[PDB]
């Protein structure tokens, strides 16, 4: 992978206050508002059956590397033109580094 990590901790706190709202990180996990984000790093997009998927996510088949996720998070509804992800696109830029680190580490 190109991206090299910031901090495993702190990113947790960000996830907990941003993403945990809609998602989970745990193995399998409840696909609450969003799907679960375990093992996503290096698994293509749309890798969790049963939950309410979209054609758009499938057709927009994304590997979920750090770059693509970093971008997506900025503008999910743009990057995938057909998502229920009514998320406030991660503008902060900095915290993202930690958050992605945590996610990467969690999704090892």
Q: Tell me which residues touch ligand HEM (CB under 6 A).
A: 18-19, 21-23, 33-35, 37, 40, 45-47, 54, 57, 64, 69, 73, 80, 83-87, 90, 103
By beta-carbon proximity to ligand HEM, the closer residue of 2 and 64 is 64
Q: Where are the alpha helices (DSSP H) in the chain?
A: 11-18, 55-59, 66-74, 76-79, 94-106
Q: How far is the CB of 4 from ligand HEM (least distance, A)?
A: 19
The answer to whether 4 and 101 are in contact (CB under 8 A) is no
Q: How far is the CB of 83 from ligand HEM (least distance, A)?
A: 3
Q: How far is the CB of 48 from ligand CYN (least distance, A)?
A: 13
Cα separation values, 25 from 62, 63, 81, 84, Å: 19, 18, 24, 19
């Amino acid at each position: 992978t190109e991206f090299k990590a910031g901090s495993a901790k702190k990113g947790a706190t960000l996830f907990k206050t941003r993403c945990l709202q809609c998602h989970t990180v745990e193995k399998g996990g409840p696909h609450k508002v969003g799907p679960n984000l375990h093992g996503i790093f290096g698994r293509q997009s749309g890798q969790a059956e049963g939950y309410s998927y979209t054609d758009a996510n499938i057709k927009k088949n994304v590997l979920w590397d750090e770059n693509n996720m970093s971008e997506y998070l900025t503008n999910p509804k743009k990057y995938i033109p057909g998502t229920k992800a009514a998320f406030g696109g991660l503008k902060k830029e900095k915290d993202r580094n930690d958050l992605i680190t945590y996610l990467k580490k969690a999704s090892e």
